[model samples]
Target: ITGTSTVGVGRGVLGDQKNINTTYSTYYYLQDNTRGDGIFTYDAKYRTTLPGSLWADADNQFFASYDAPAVDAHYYAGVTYDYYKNVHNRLSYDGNNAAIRSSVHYSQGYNNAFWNGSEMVYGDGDGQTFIPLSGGIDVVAHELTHAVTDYTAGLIYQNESGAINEAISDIFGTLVEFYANKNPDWEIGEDVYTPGISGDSLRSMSDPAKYGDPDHYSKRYTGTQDNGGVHINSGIINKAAYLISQGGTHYGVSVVGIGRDKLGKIFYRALTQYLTPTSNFSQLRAAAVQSATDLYGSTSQEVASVKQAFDAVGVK
Candidate 1:
C-alpha cells in the first residue's frame, strides 16, 4: 500500500508487484505513506472500474448509499481524479500541490451527497426519499465535477452562476459515466441506475422528461427546493447541452452531426476556457455555442440546435 494504513486488497499506481490485486476490481484502498504522516489519504488506483454494490442493507457486504467504508469512496475518488486527468488533461483539483482528499461515510445516515468546498462527501441514504448519493457513477461524478467547477469558473452558489454550476455538474457527470463504460460500473455503454428499481437516472441528457419531471426551461422555474432546485432546474442546461450535441429537440434529434464526443469536448473547453465565474445560463449557453462556432462556424447546424436548446429550456 502507498499509505501507512494497511487494509484488504490494494492496487498500486500501475497495479504491479505483490501489493497489487490480480482481479480487475475497484482496489478500494491503496496509499503512499512515504511521509509517514499517519493520515491515510485514499488512492483508489485500479485497472478497472468497480460498480458500488446495490441494496443499502446488510443483505450485501457493501456500504449502503455510498457512505462507503473505504472501498466505494476510494473507488469513486479515483474515478473522479481520472476523469479530469484523461478528459480535461488536468492533474489534480487545484492543478498544483496537495492531492484531493475524499471522505466517504460522512455523518451516519446523512442522506445527501455533496462536495463541501473541497473533496466529495456521501451520505448513507435515508432509504425513504433518496438513495446513497455515491451509489452511481453519475452522482459520484456529479460531486467531483463540483470541485472542478469551483476551481475553474468558481461559480456562485446562486442565480445564474448556480445554474452553470449545476449544469457543469450534470454535463460532466454524464461524461464520466459514458467514459467509464462497462468497467465495473456498467455505465460506459449502457446505464447506472442502481438496483434497477429507479430504472431511469438522476438526470437524462437523452430525454429529461422521460422521467416525467419537466425537461425544458420554463419561467415558472423559481429555483426553490433543494439548493434552489439545482437538480430540477439543471434539466434545462442538461437538455440544452444534450440537444446541442445530440442535435435533436425535446423529442429527438433531427439533423445530428456534432456528435456526443465533440459536443462534450467543446463544452468542456468552453467551460474551462470561455466561461467565467459570473456567467449565467444564458452566458454559459452562449459561451458554449460561441466555442462551437469558433471551432466549427456560425452556419454549422449544431450551432442552431445549441441556441435552440437554450430557448427550449425557457431562457429569454
Candidate 2:
C-alpha cells in the first residue's frame, strides 16, 4: 500500500478552488499526513453516524456534489489548525497537535455539527437553514473549539458551564473568522446559514438580542431544552466578549475597547488555565478578570474592559 503525496485541486462548497492534500494509495484519498496523524476528511454519505470512509477521487482532483463538503471540511480544519498554532501558539485542539478529523454529509437534511468527544461531525443542512455545515469556517471552528474545551476546562455540557462552553466556541470561532480575515464579523455561521436568505446568521455576538437571544444575564433562559439553554444562554457571554473587544454601552454600563488580539489572549488564557468544569457566570467573570490581569496588568485597560464587559452583561 505504498502511496505518494499529492496536491489535489478542488472546489469547496462555495466554489473556491484550493489545493487539498491527498495520498495516492488505491485512489486519491483526502488525508493530509503532515500535521500530527494528519487532518483527515471523510464522506459520511448522508448517514446519521460515524467517521465514514476516506473520501476518494479517481484523478486526485475533487470537485463534485459529494466532494464539496469534504473539500471545505478539510480546508477549514487546516485553517482552524493554523489559527490556533499561529495565534495562540498552541498545537491542535489538544495543544499537542492531535489529528483533526471531520466527517461531512451526516444524515439527511440535518442542520447541525459537533465534536463528539473524538472528532468533528458535520451535517449537510436542511437546505433551508444551512448548506453544508463545513461551508462556514465559523461553524467548523465552533465544533473544533468544543474539542479544545473538552481537553482544557472540560466544561460540562449542561447549565451555566455549558452555556459558557458554547460561548467560548462562538468567541473563538468568530476570532478564527477574523484570523483568516474572510469578511469577518461578530456573527456565527453567517457564511453558510440560510442559503436563500442574505445577511443573516445563526447568532450575533455584536447584538445577541438581534435574534431573540438574551444579551443580559437576568434574561437567561432557565429551561431544560438545549442542554439547559446552552445555545440560548451563551448569547449573554457572547455579548460580553464582543463588548470587551469593541467597547460598548449596555444598560448604562460602558466598556473600553481592548481590541480582538488582547480579547483573544485573555479569553484563551482563561479557557486554558483558569476555567473549570462547573464554573458559573460569576466564576467566569472572575476568571476573565484574572486572565486579563495576568496578560495585561491589573490596572491595564484590558483588565478594566474585561470587568466592565462582564458587568455590562450583568454577570457581576
Candidate 3:
C-alpha cells in the first residue's frame, strides 16, 4: 500500500535492539526505502504460505515479542543491502537496484531459511535447534548472497558447483558480519542456532571440523545426500576463505593472511567475472587466482595468498 517512509524500533530474537525502516499509510508496514528500490518484509503467520501479509502495525515502533522476527528480517536485509552497495558498489542482489523482499515466521517450528529462487524466507526455529533465523545477520546475509549468486555466477546447485554456491554464501555472510562489527567472528548462525548453547553454530568457517564438516578437500563428502553434499563439502571452500582472510596452517600447509577486504574483492571479482555454472574446485582456484591478479596484480602478495590459501585447504 502507499505510505511514507518512517523509522521503527524493535528488539530481535537475540534481544538486541535495532532501528528499522518502515512505511506508514493505512498502517505501519515493514518496508525500507533506503536501499535499492526498497526492502519489504512480511509475516508468514506460522503457515506454509509465503509472504503472507504486509505486516501492519498501529505504531511505527515494533518491540513486541511477536514482532521480533520481522524487525530483524527487515533490519538485517538493509544491512546486507548496504554491505553490497557501500562495499561492492553493487546496487542490489540483481545489481539493478531490485527491491528485496523477505518473509519471516514461515511455519510452526520451522528451523531453516533459504532464498527460495526469488525472495528470502526465514523460519521461527523449533527452539531446540534455533531461534528465528533472521535474528542472525550472518544468516540473513547468507541467504541474500544466494540470490546474488543466482544472478551472477549461476553456480549449478549440485556436486562441486553446489558446494561452491554454499561456500560463497558462507564467505559473503561472514564478510557482512565483519562489516557490521557486531561481535564479529568467522562462525555462522551462532547467535540464532541453539539458543541454549553458548558458542555452537550451524557452521564454522574458522573450523569446519568443529561441526563435522570437511576442512580439507581430501575429506569432502562424495555421497549423494544434501544435493551431493553441497552444504557439507562447502566447508572446504569455507576454510579456504577463512584462511585467505585470516591465514592459517592445515595439514602442514600454511597461508599468509591477506585480510578481509582483499579477500572480498578477489572473491567478488571471481564470482562476477570468472565463475561458471560448472566450475569445480580446480576451476575455482584458477578463478580466485586470476581475480586476485586482476585486482592486485600477478606479483602481489594478495595473489600469492590466494594461491596458498587454496593450497592449504587442499583445493588443488
Candidate 4:
C-alpha cells in the first residue's frame, strides 16, 4: 500500500461521477510500487504489484529494502481485478466493490504464502529452491481464491470439500497465469525457482504424472500440511482440469480431442456457476460435464471429450 495514491473513489480524471472510479464501493486493486521512486514506469516486472509500489524521490523517504515484495503483490492484484472484470463480468471479487488487502514481506524468511481468511499474505523463499512465493500467479491466485471459495461454498476444509477447495484454487489459480501470459500453458511459476535439484514447480498441470514425489493422490496428501494439503493434493484436481483442457493425452496416448481454451471455459463456468461447497471429484465431474453439455451440447466433441479426459485421469 506504500508509494501509491488512491484518487479517493470520488477523485479521478473525470468529475466526481458515479462509477467513474467511485461507481463501486469495493476496494479491488492494491497496485503499489516498491521501486521507481514514484516516477511511474510501466515496467512488466512492476505489473506484479497490485497497489502502486513505485519508489518516491529522496525527499520523500525512499526505502529500498521494502520494494521487491510490494511490487510483486501489486502487479498480480491489478491483473486479477482485470481478469474478474473481463472474464466473469465481475466488477470486483464479491461483485459488490470489495477492497482486497494484501500484506507482503509477511514473515522474515517465511517459506510459504497464504490467505488467512480476509487478506492475502506472502513469504520470501530461500534463493535455492524458491525465491519468493508471490512471484507465481497460480500461487497468489490460489491463496486468494481460498477467500472466494470460503465466501461461496465455505468448504469444510476436509474430505471432499477440501478437494473442492484445493481444486478451486488450482483451477482459477492456473487460469490467472494463462490469462496474464495469454496462453493455456500449465507451468506454474516458472519464474521463481533458480533451477536447482529437480526444480520444476509446486505441481505440474500439464503432466501431473511426472512429479517424482508420488504423482498419485494418497492419504498423505490430506495430512497435516497447509489447511490439510489444500495446496498439495490440489495437484490432482490440477491435472484433472489440465487433462480436460488438453483433451486428455500425454506421451502419444490420446484420450480425446478438444481445445484447451474451450475446456478451461467450461471449468471456469462450472466452478463459478454451479459448484457447491461440498462438491467432490464425483460431483465436479458430473456438474462440469453437465455444464459442458448444456453450453456445448452432449453431442459436441468438446463436451464428450472433456468428460472422457477426466475418465482417462481416473476421475469419475
Candidate 5:
C-alpha cells in the first residue's frame, strides 16, 4: 500500500463535507501518512472480524452513503491524534507513534464502537438507538483514549479501576470535543445518540443524573452488573471532571472552575504518571491532587480545584 499521499473529498455520516487523507495506489485507499506513523481505516463489511479490508475507492471522492462511516472514522481518528500530540505533547496512543487503525460497518444494528486493543471498531447502529457511531467525534476520541489508557495507566477493567478507565475516556473525549470547538458540550454521544430524541445523550458529565447515572459517590452502584458498574459509577468521576473544568456545587460542596486545559493537564499527568492498574476512586483523587500539585504547586487554584472537585464528588 505504499503510494503518494493524497487528499480526498468526502461527506461524513452527518452529511458534513471534509477532506480525508488517502493513498494513491491502484485505488485510492484510506491510509493517511500525515500524522505519526499513519492513520489507516478499513471496512468491516458487517462481520465480526477485525480491520477487514482496507477501504478502497476507484476515485478519491467518497460521497457514497456506504462511505460515510469510513470517512468520519478516518477523519476523526486524525483529529484525536492531533489533540493528543498538540495539546498533551503525547505522540500516538502508545506514545511511540503507533499506526492508528479503524474499521466501520462492524455488524448489522450494532449499537456501539470500541477499541479492540489493536484497532478501533465502529458499529452501524440500528438507526434507532444510533446512527453510524463514528459520526460522533467524542465517541471516536473516547475509544481512542481507551488505547491511551491501555498504554499508560493500564487500569484494570473492573470495579473502581474500571470506572476510572471509563471516566478517563469520557473526560478526554470531551476535552477533544472542546479542542475541536464543534458544538462542544459536557455530554457524551449527543451527536449520534437517538436521532428521534432531539436532546438526549448516552451520558452527561455536566449532570450525570440526567441519564440516571450516579453523580456522587454515595449513590454509586455496588452491584455485580456492568463489570461492577463501570459505566454506572463513572458518573461520579465524570461529574468531578465536569466540576473541575466548570465549577459547580454538589451536595453543598463547591469547586472553582479551573478551565478545561488545566483539567486535561491534571488528568493526563495522573493517568500517565500516578495511576496504577488497580487504582480505586480514593486513589484517583490522590493522583489528581498530586498531578495538579506537580503542575501548579500545592497552593495553586489548580490544586485547590482538584481537591474540591474530588471532595464535591465525595471521592474521599
Candidate 6:
C-alpha cells in the first residue's frame, strides 16, 4: 500500500517497548519503507498460509496481546536488515535490497519457523514450549540467513550440504545477535524457546552435545531422518565455528580464539566466494582455510586458527 512512512510505538512478544516503522494509508500498516524495498510483516491469524494479511492498526499503537508477534516480526526484520547492510556491506539477502516479508501466528500451536524459499513464517508455540519465535532476534536472523544462503551458495538442503547450510545460518544468526548487542550469546532461539524454563535454547553452538548433537565428525548421525541429520549433524560444523571464534579444546585438540569479527569475515567470504551445492565437511574445511587465507595472508594467525579449529572438530 502507498502512504507516507511513519513510526509507531509497540510492545513486542517479550513485553519490551519499541518503535516500529509503519505506513499510514488511512490506517497504519506494518510496511517499513526505511530499508531496502521494505520490510513487510503480516498476520497469519492462526492459519497455515503465506503472508496472510498485511498487519494494520487503527491508532498506530500496538500493545494488544495479539499484536505482540507482528510488532516483533516487523521490528526485528528491520534490525536484521541493518545488520546485513552496515556490518556486512550487503544490501539485503539477495544483495539487491529485496523486500523482506514475514508472517506471524501461523497455525494454532505451531512450534517452529522457517524460510519457505520466498519469505519467512513464524509459529506461535504451544505456550509452554515457545512464545513467539520472532521475539528472538537470533531466530529471525537464522531464517533470514537461509535466504542469503539460497541466493549465494545455493547449498543443497540434504545430507552434508544441508548440514553446512544449517551451520551457516547458525553462524550468521549468532553474528547478527552479537551485532545487535542485545544479551548476545552462542545459543540459538533462547529468547523465544521455553517460556517457563530458563537458560535453555533450541541448540548450543558452543556445546552442541548439551542437546545430544554431535560435536565431532566421527560422532555424526548418518540416519535418514532430519534430511540426513541436517539439524543433527550441524553440530559438527557449529562446534568448529565456535572453536574458530572462541577457542576451546575438544578431544585433546586445542584452537586459539580468533574473536567473532574475524570468524564472521572468514565465513562470509567462504559462503560468498567458495562454498558450492555439494560441498561436504572436508570441502568446508578447505573453504574456510582458503577464506581465512584470502582475508589474512596464508601465513597469518587467522589461517592457522581456521586449520586448527577444523582439526579440533575432526573435519579434516
Candidate models: Cα lDDT each: 0.55, 0.89, 0.90, 0.57, 0.94, 0.92
**How well does candidate 5 match the true structure in TM-score terms?**
0.98
Model number with the top lDDT:
5
Clashing residue pairs, backbone N/CA/C < 3 A, model 1: 2-31, 2-32, 2-33, 3-31, 3-32, 3-33, 65-132, 181-188, 217-313, 248-253
RMSD of 5: 0.8
Name model 4 segments beyond 4 Å from true. 1-65, 182-184, 194-199, 213-229, 250-253
Per-residue error for 188 in candidate 3, Å, reads 1.1
Candidate 1 lDDT: 0.55
Shift of residue 34 alpha carbon in model 5, Å: 0.3
Candidate 5 residue 147 Cα shift, in angstroms, is 1.0
Candidate 1 local Cα displacement, residue 16, angstroms: 21
True lDDT of residue 79, candidate 6: 93
Give the CA lDDT, 0 to 100, for residue 291 in model 2: 88
lDDT of 5: 0.94
- Candidate 4 residue 132 C-alpha distance from true site, Å: 2.5
Whichever of 1 and 3 has more TM-score, that candidate is 3
**How many residue pairs clash in all the candidates, one count each?**
10, 0, 0, 29, 0, 0
lDDT for each residue of candidate 3 in 14-119, tens digit (9 for 90 to 100)? 7888898888997899988877799889988988887889888888878898999999888889999899999999989999999888999998888898899879
The number of clashing residue pairs in model 5 is 0
Q: Candidate 5 lDDT, tens digit per residue, 185-258?
A: 99999999998998899999999999999999999999999999998899999999999989988889899998
Whose lDDT is higher: candidate 3's or candidate 4's?
A: 3
**Candidates by lDDT, descending order:** 5, 6, 3, 2, 4, 1
